[PDB]
């Protein structure tokens, strides 16, 4: 239930997390739970929701990579690295309020 996202701006990660929460199809949104570094965070949620969020992020990454490969504005490409944490339960989540 914990996935570490590196090489990404935490503010941008929160923004597209809100975007991923916006659509009706997602019944529960993953929540950014900890902030390790200036470009590293860990988000906590149901593993299916984490996989769907990785799908969304990789779609955005592929769009930006295709845009750069066509010789357009190519400053940087949003290519976060997703790595699974070695916990059993998620932590720092309001869903554990009870």
């Amino acid at each position: 239930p914990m996935v570490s996202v590196t090489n990404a701006d935490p503010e941008r990660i929160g923004r597209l997390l809100d975007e991923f929460a916006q659509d009706v199809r997602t019944v529960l949104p993953p929540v950014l739970s900890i902030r390790n570094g200036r470009r590293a965070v860990v988000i906590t949620g149901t593993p299916e929701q984490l996989s769907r969020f990785e799908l969304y992020c990789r779609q955005i990454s592929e769009k930006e990579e295709a845009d750069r490969k066509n010789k357009v504005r190519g400053g940087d490409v949003f290519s976060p690295v997703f790595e699974p944490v070695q916990v059993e339960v998620g932590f720092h989540t309001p869903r554990l309020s009870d």
Binding site: V24, V27, S51, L55
Partner: protein, 659 residues
């Protein structure tokens, strides 16, 4: 292990928790014929078998349910003193939630009596089942826990033989043994485990298990679940747990039939010899074939069986002759009736063999809707659908002014928005803009696939403009062949030039449609093409079908419907049904929105289906392929929806496959 995951629904071995004290009290108060099996051998008591039968209701909100335990008069068999106890669970409203029958065997004292076998799969078989060949489903390796106190506290039975050592020695066992019902629930989870692959989820209705051997904690038990039979679509499955090389428990399961989708294709699949193998195979297929051909020869004036079996050049009906060079089948009404009769034959063969789900919803393409209504729902019979289809096909050709040589000024083609950067937010705008630029009439008709299948119908000059734009954008972006002209047909169906014969089609339908109708047979089971929502008895539905497309006999219901619902429910239901079916003719299809509603789970809104089997020929499975690409696209790539062809995948669909 890693690949499996517990099912989203509660396994039936969850209601057994709170009812343990009642069963123990029943055991304590149980009596044989002048004798009580509570004194002599309670320490030697063991769980013999467990049978679970559930009713469709299952609590989801924390409720206050009641259980009653009745202990039958214990007998004395050749293996031990068997005491059977029946427990039923009921909600606050008194409705029965589930029925459990478990027998306990006091291993010590025996007698001379017959040990009757427990009901198979909790007695959930409806006496109409076929022993299909066994198919491998899953194998699991679950290790019994070293300590069984956690299972004792979570379940509720604190029998010391499973936990204590002194009581285990007193009972005659070297070491404590695991709960048999732990094996029961482990096998249930193994049979209802979800792997994410293409297979419908398992919701057990009836489930029985017999415990043969004894398992010590820490023993590696391995299961093996095999498909056995089918019962009205729902399949019978069994599991044989084994610890090493000896059978320990043999359980059989009757799980619920998944809610499937029966899609019916549209034009373009017809060829010589449609479903003739099915005709030669089944007897119900022959029956529907004979009824259809007799009806066609008695009312229409031609033999549909000859039309499908052989492709002549021209046939003569009651009125005049019909000619088509590459085959008389390819012309409209003959193709439509061939589609209808082939779909009916396959549906009858499926439901005669027992592979048909009763509660499955019905959907299809523009003309496959009537076939769905007749076959899946049975709102009307074969003859009525055939006559209405032939009438609408005949009425279709004489509403568009055409050339004396057969030509017309309307052609359609399939535009593919691939690499041209188009989507649902731009495609209608693209069509409108290019139509204004051309100055001709252009419309959207078929919303088939989200990515690379759209249909545009319009004038020849407009279609040439479409082709030029598509080629220029293709050469701008690279070769894709995004524009393919339709072969042969030149009638702009689902357009505004088809508002002339709508009233005549409506009156023909009213003549054909029966005076009385059953709204319940169609409510919640039918997805119309023009409005992709479920058929519902709501003011919202009638408002949508009125404001989206005009209807002069509908404004009366809009003005007042509450007291009119209290007055004529059936009449107004039939009226809205026939109105929707009639204006389907001039309305474009919404296959995209129906597929979206049909593939999104119940959570977040949408019909969450498990099987999508379309009933069409194997020569060109258009609906199956388009559904496969729709599932394949990046959105809902994790959806475990099984897509099958009723002819190509017949072995899997009828469950007559092996390995």
């Amino acid at each position: 292990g890693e690949p499996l995951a517990p099912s989203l629904t509660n396994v039936p071995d969850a209601l057994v928790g709170p009812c343990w004290p009642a069963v123990f009290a029943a055991i304590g108060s149980a009596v044989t014929d002048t004798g009580e099996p509570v004194v002599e051998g309670l320490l030697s008591l063991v769980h013999l078998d467990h049978a679970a039968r559930v009713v469709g209701q299952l609590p989801t909100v924390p409720a206050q349910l009641t259980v009653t335990a009745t202990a039958a008069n214990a007998t004395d068999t050749d293996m031990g003193r068997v005491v059977p106890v029946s427990v039923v669970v009921t909600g606050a409203d008194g409705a029965v939630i589930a029925t459990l029958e478990e027998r306990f065997a006091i291993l010590g004292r025996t007698g001379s009596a017959e040990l009757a076998d427990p009901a198979r799969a909790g007695g959930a078989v409806s006496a109409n089942a076929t022993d299909t060949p066994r198919r491998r489903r899953r194998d699991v390796t679950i290790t019994a826990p070293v300590d069984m106190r956690p299972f004792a506290v979570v379940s509720g039975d604190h029998n010391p033989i499973h936990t204590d050592r002194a009581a285990a020695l007193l009972a005659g066992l070297e070491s404590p043994i695991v709960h048999g019902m732990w094996l029961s629930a482990a096998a249930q989870h193994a049979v209802t485990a979800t792997d994410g692959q293409a297979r419908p989820p398992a919701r057990l209705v009836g489930w029985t298990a017999r415990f043969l051997g004894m398992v010590r904690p820490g023993d590696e038990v391995d299961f093996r679940v095999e498909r056995v039979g089918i019962d009205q679509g729902a399949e019978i499955v069994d599991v044989a747990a084994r610890v090493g090389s000896d059978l320990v428990m043999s359980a059989s399961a009757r799980l619920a039939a998944p809610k499937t989708v029966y899609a019916f294709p549209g034009q373009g699949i017809q060829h010589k010899g449609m479903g003739m193998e099915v005709r030669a195979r089944s007897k119900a297929a022959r029956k529907v074939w004979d009824t259809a051909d007799k009806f066609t020869r008695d009312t229409l004036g031609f033999s549909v069986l000859h039309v499908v079996r052989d492709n002549p050049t021209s046939i003569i009906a009651s009125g005049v002759h019909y000619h088509h060079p590459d085959g008389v089948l390819y012309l409209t009404q003959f193709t439509q009736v061939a589609m209808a009769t082939v779909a009916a034959a396959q549906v009858a063969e499926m439901r005669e063999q027992g592979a048909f789900v009763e509660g499955a919803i019905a959907c299809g393409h523009s003309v496959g809707e009537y076939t769905a209504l007749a076959c899946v729902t049975g709102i009307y019979q074969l003859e009525a659908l055939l006559e209405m289809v032939f009438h609408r096909g005949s009425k279709m050709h004489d509403i568009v002014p055409r050339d004396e040589l057969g030509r017309s000024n309307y052609r359609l083609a399939a535009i593919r928005p691939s690499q041209i950067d188009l989507d649902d937010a731009d495609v209608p705008a693209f069509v409108a803009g290019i139509a204004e630029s051309t100055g001709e009439f252009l419309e959207i008709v078929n919303f088939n696939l989200r990515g690379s299948q759209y249909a545009i119908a319009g004038t020849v000059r407009g279609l040439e403009a479409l082709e030029a734009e598509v080629e220029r954008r293709r050469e701008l972006t690279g070769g894709r062949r995004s524009f393919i002209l339709v072969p042969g047909i030149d009638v702009p169906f689902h357009s505004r030039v088809l508002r002339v014969g709508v009233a005549e089609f409506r009156r023909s339908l009213d003549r054909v449609m029966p005076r009385d109708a059953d709204p319940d047979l169609i409510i919640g089971r039918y997805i119309p093409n023009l409005v992709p929502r479920l058929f519902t008895l709501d003011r919202d539905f009638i408002q949508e079908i009125r404001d989206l497309v005009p209807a002069e006999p509908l404004d009366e219901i809009l003005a007042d419907y509450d007291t009119w619902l209290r007055e004529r429910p059936r009449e107004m239901a039939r009226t809205v049904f026939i109105e929707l079916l009639a204006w389907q003719f001039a309305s474009p299809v919404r296959w995209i929105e129906t597929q979206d509603l049909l593939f999104i789970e119940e959570a977040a809104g949408g019909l969450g289906v498990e099987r999508f089997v379309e009933i069409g020929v194997k020569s060109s499975p258009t609906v199956a392929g388009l559904a496969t690409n729709t599932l394949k696209l990046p959105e809902y790539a994790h959806s475990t929806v099984e897509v099958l062809n009723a002819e190509r995948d017949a072995a899997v669909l009828f469950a007559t496959d092996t390995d």
